């Protein structure tokens, strides 16, 4: 099983073995995804920790500029988001799908993730090419708790 797959399944033994045999920790697949990205996408906290501790680069992006952060944000994997935020990744980066970590957190109704992003410097007034920001999206989708967190943050700034 590829290192990506071992990561996605949380197969700590086989994954730890493989990092010994070959230097493959940052090896990308066809879509530019690192094992770390696969681990983030599947909410494998233990694996994410293992990978970061063993040289995995959290800033590496997919072909469509996908990030480990946005992948974890989109699913509401709060514990992984914290870890990656603590790596010092950019919070405000866009991908080709026009999404940012905040927009994916908002889209998924992940209130805790939204709070965490905003506290890490994610800017809720940055817009997609369509002209809507994170507040707009929260209002559009009817996510009232998410709306309040964003509005509260904005209010404290002004």
């Amino acid at each position: 099983l590829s290192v990506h797959q071992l990561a996605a399944q949380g197969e700590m033994l086989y994954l730890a073995t493989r990092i010994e045999q070959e230097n493959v920790i940052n090896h990308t697949d066809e879509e530019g995804f690192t094992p770390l990205m696969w681990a983030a996408a599947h909410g494998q906290i233990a694996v994410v920790e293992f990978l970061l501790q063993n040289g995995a680069d959290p800033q590496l992006l997919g072909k469509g500029r996908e990030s480990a952060l946005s992948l974890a944000c989109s699913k509401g994997y709060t514990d992984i988001v914290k870890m990656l935020l603590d790596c010092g990744v950019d919070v405000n980066e866009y991908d080709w799908n026009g999404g940012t970590p905040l927009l994916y957190a908002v889209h998924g109704n992940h209130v805790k993730c939204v709070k965490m992003l905003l506290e890490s410097g994610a800017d809720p007034t940055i817009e997609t090419d369509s002209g809507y920001n994170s507040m707009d999206l929260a209002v559009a989708l009817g996510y009232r708790s998410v709306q309040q967190v964003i509005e509260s943050h904005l209010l404290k700034l002004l």
């Binding site: 990205m37 946005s70 999404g99 994916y104």
Partner: peptide, 11 residues
Amino acid sequence: LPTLPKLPSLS
């Protein structure tokens, strides 16, 4: 294959 949701896209 890890996937992100398609987000709203306005004309």
